[PDB]
Design a protein around this ligand. Structure first.
Ligand SMILES: NC(=O)c1ccc[n+]([C@@H]2O[C@H](COP(=O)([O-])OP(=O)(O)OC[C@H]3O[C@@H](n4cnc5c(N)ncnc54)[C@H](O)[C@@H]3O)[C@@H](O)[C@H]2O)c1
Ligand SMILES: NC(=O)c1ccc[n+]([C@@H]2O[C@H](COP(=O)([O-])OP(=O)(O)OC[C@H]3O[C@@H](n4cnc5c(N)ncnc54)[C@H](O)[C@@H]3O)[C@@H](O)[C@H]2O)c1
Ligand SMILES: NC(=O)c1ccc[n+]([C@@H]2O[C@H](COP(=O)([O-])OP(=O)(O)OC[C@H]3O[C@@H](n4cnc5c(N)ncnc54)[C@H](O)[C@@H]3O)[C@@H](O)[C@H]2O)c1
Ligand SMILES: NC(=O)c1ccc[n+]([C@@H]2O[C@H](COP(=O)([O-])OP(=O)(O)OC[C@H]3O[C@@H](n4cnc5c(N)ncnc54)[C@H](O)[C@@H]3O)[C@@H](O)[C@H]2O)c1
Lengths: 284, 278, 280, 274
């Protein structure tokens, strides 16, 4: 029937039988623009760098204090991959800076096709006796900060009248209390925010599907991004990887490839789900 | 071994499995105790033989006092009204003191207080978002904090029950689109991973931490807001094709609070009439 | 007659204001009849002893080899709790014995209002190099056997035109690979079958809700049931916050919750009784 | 642990998605997901064996020749019923003999047996377990047997389902996926166990859980009202296409996912959120 002809047109079965078509083209980010938060840190800058090499304009977003490190990273990535990689400072806990970041993203870059909302922090003393300061500091940065930065991203997309890809950095702390030889790590408030970020991403996926916007999370395990260099002896290293079958820390590049996949058309039917990158931690 | 892991306790004639659901000699509190889930949980625990503090907003003091008097007479336990806005850190600090002074100790807490702020969708404003976090997430944290602080200071175990939600796992489906539970869903997911950490962290101290995730419960909050077509439309994705009742949450709170759940910690019990299946 | 008057009658708010009402009555199994598979094991007999003490008639079901043990336990629990507790031997891999079980359940009990599908096995050499023999034996017993015993339970319920509660024993192994000092324990096929039982239970919960039948899984962690007999013990309890094995009565109390009206709005979900393992 | 590989003229993140010199096989290679996955891995520069029922031998050969021409790689056809242990043993030997070794396996073969509801018979139940569970375990087992015997790592990819996580929803009732859902759930915990057990061997094990994908299996079996009634709970409000599964299979097969093991990627256009 015409009903079957409609389905056969809507859903092509074998694009690989077109000479001009390639499955590798899906991982391209050419003619696309977006921003990366916490882009001074290992996961942020490496993710941004991977998106730039795929051929995307990337605004490197981090604290005002990182302005110098941002602008030189923005310059290095620009000359390396011949892309418009700019630097924009914004404290994500300050609404005024977030409101002004929205303005500069649209003006300096052009639009937002993707957003890697990676900015986050683990506060010391984040255990069962996490104080009001330790609790609220984590909630204000991880949950409220992300929400705001996530909001301006999908605000621009709808206002510009096109789709896009939201990638929120969660954690296994959002799934499990991180195991350390009988006792858990201090990730009480930290885990709560990442679990909140996860179900937030899931809601936006459901709500913004009609707008052509996908929303997914990456839950990295132990990744050696530079966060705690010279702050973990090999006794600690080998002790931490007890419960990681692969018995090694992840690297920034192994997260960068996952961000690329979620940002690109390779994941065009992936929304409202999580991709764990933990070397099999979640199995235990 | 063997001596500390009895295989067949039922072979003792003076033992009974039903004694594990008893709460006689137990003392604790319930937040949101003016609401359907809270007051029915409080009444269940009191009927099981516990002393209960009914905790809610200052504006609910008269209702709480009425409820507390009613439950005391019916069940013959110490049921008292104690007001606390969980957003106010000063009132939470005072709540800790009055719990200890008027009950003696805390062996259980049902941290049930929560709101659904209107306009909680993709376009959630700073106010709608932060209000939901401040009440549901921060409010539940600090009320949870004083409960296990009292337990450890008094040198005994206890059971924390946090009210999460189905919204914490899934976005509530209604006729193609999700219901506005953007911030709400986020706070309930946070509470579930919060309770999990505490379960692992406070096992040393003999304290269990678990969540209940209610589906659709006819608590009083839906009265006069929905019609029959809306009722049926909401329950399209609920196999049992009916709202749960306050007694069905109350029986679950008694299980997790009592010794029946003695080896149950860092987990969640969904009470949603099979919603989560879909 | 008003829409709100119907809702008020459908959904009572404060049943405790009925002086004849008690929340503890929801845990009674008086006038309820059911069966427990693997009833010779620790989890099985204790669950049965609990349900009998709550006031239920119980058929104790296990392998033909356990007949004498089942008879002794069935006579013991009958004297103790003053209910009709009977023994009915059945190999869950044998379709003729399971058809014979369905007959004797209706003939000797009268009906089936609850079923604890607890029978299960852990086969030696169940690792990455699990053989066709080890794999298929696990699947034949754990998955296919549990399916059959579960099927006749909800067949009897629907044939007798009433609801009931199915309880399937899953495991921690169904969610995660059990941790031992860097490597997983041999639960390759075992883990697979327990994960299959969980999603099997979840389908039945959705399908049988209209028939008034509830389906739930219990996922025990490390329970000292008698299947076991400082070292090794502590290595396994390294990732258990409570740093102790569960006892059979701690699973039995979870079964009684799921079998009783205490869980009347609980269906298509799992209850982890693992002392906080899942957290790690 | 390098911190910034991007700061290197001899490095590309896109190169991680290459399969140059990689050898492996795809079960269910006659169907939409299988053949399009194979095509994607072939175009990435892998030698690929198309594995399906003996009845599909002619179709597999035509595809294997078509794919070999377009992508200039050794794409071959092998018959194997996954319910037959003798044919699986024959497959293992033929895989090594015709490819050389197996660096990856996409265990994608599966069936949805009609009458698979609450009253799924012994015949309907056992058929689903035989094919989906025992057959997937077999084809998986010979894959990591070869990898380890040949003393190198690899990537196992098992096709699970949405049905493995949730009972598919349609107008207030679950669709008949009783045994189906059970097998797909078993495959996910199977994959998780292998991920933990074979990590030291350099072998990764992951699952893909498709929602509704217009692979060809739905052709002429659903009308427009039925189509729309199914997409009520899919926010993207459309079926997936074989290419959208293929891109996911390539990610999990390739070095792009080098730190991804013992997990699942749902490709359901947002289904899981409800
Ligand atoms: N590397 C890991 O082990 C790991 C594991 C799980 C989760 N994560 C998460 O990944 C993300 C990146 O972490 P990382 O490993 O690269 O270490 P990192 O500390 O270098 O990265 C965090 C970055 O977020 C920025 N940040 C914090 N608060 C901010 C604020 N108000 N405004 C703007 N920027 C702010 C920081 O400046 C930093 O550059 C974090 O969100 C972290 O929670 C990391
Ligand atoms: N009824 C349902 O269908 C349902 C479903 C999922 C989750 N929940 C959650 O269960 C819990 C109780 O639900 P309910 O049905 O009884 O609704 P409810 O509104 O009647 O009960 C919640 C109570 O929390 C109190 N509250 C709000 N803000 C407070 C604050 N700052 N400080 C102290 N108290 C405050 C309220 O006064 C109220 O009495 C809530 O957390 C709710 O989010 C309910
Ligand atoms: N550490 C634990 O105790 C633990 C943890 C997780 C899951 N489980 C599961 O709990 C259930 C009971 O475990 P248990 O601790 O009592 O050990 P158990 O071996 O003593 O009990 C299992 C019983 O099932 C019976 N069985 C095996 N195959 C059978 C067949 N074809 N037909 C009839 N009966 C058969 C056995 O005879 C046995 O009595 C099992 O399914 C087990 O996999 C146990
Ligand atoms: N298309 C979807 O919407 C969808 C959704 C969820 C899961 N899946 C699963 O994805 C996989 C591919 O499905 P599909 O959409 O391409 O449908 P399909 O039926 O066209 O492809 C499956 C292939 O497996 C083969 N097969 C069946 N039994 C076999 C046996 N004993 N031995 C060897 N091969 C056998 C079949 O010949 C078939 O070519 C399946 O496992 C399916 O269960 C598909």
């Amino acid at each position: 029937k015409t009903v079957e002809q409609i389905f056969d047109e809507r859903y092509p079965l074998d694009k690989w039988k077109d000479s001009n078509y390639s499955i590798l083209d899906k991982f391209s980010m050419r003619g696309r623009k977006g921003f990366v938060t916490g882009a001074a840190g290992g996961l942020g800058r490496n993710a941004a760098a991977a998106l730039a090499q795929a051929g995307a304009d990337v605004a490197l977003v981090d604290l005002p204090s990182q302005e110098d490190k941002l602008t030189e990273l923005a310059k290095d990535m620009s000359e390396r991959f011949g892309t418009n990689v700019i630097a924009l400072t914004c404290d994500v806990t300050d609404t005024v800076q977030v409101a002004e970041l929205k303005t500069q993203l649209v003006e300096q870059l052009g639009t937002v096709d993707f957003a890697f909302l990676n900015a986050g922090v683990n506060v010391p003393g984040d255990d069962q006796d996490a104080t009001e300061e330790v609790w609220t500091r984590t909630i204000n940065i991880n949950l409220n900060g992300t929400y705001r930065t996530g909001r301006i991203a999908h605000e621009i997309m709808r206002e510009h009248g096109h789709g896009g890809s939201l990638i929120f950095t969660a954690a296994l702390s959002g799934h499990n209390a991180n195991y350390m030889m009988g006792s858990p790590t201090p990730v009480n408030a930290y885990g709560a925010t990442k679990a909140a970020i996860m179900e937030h991403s899931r809601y936006l996926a459901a709500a913004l599907a009609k707008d052509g916007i996908r929303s997914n999370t990456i839950s990295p395990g132990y990744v050696w991004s530079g966060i705690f260099n010279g702050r973990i002896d090999m006794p600690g290293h080998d002790a931490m990887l007890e419960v990681v079958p692969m018995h090694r820390f992840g690297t920034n590049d192994e997260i960068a490839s996952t961000v690329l996949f979620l940002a690109s058309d390779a994941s065009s039917y992936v929304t409202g789900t999580d991709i764990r990158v933990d070397g099999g931690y979640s199995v235990f």
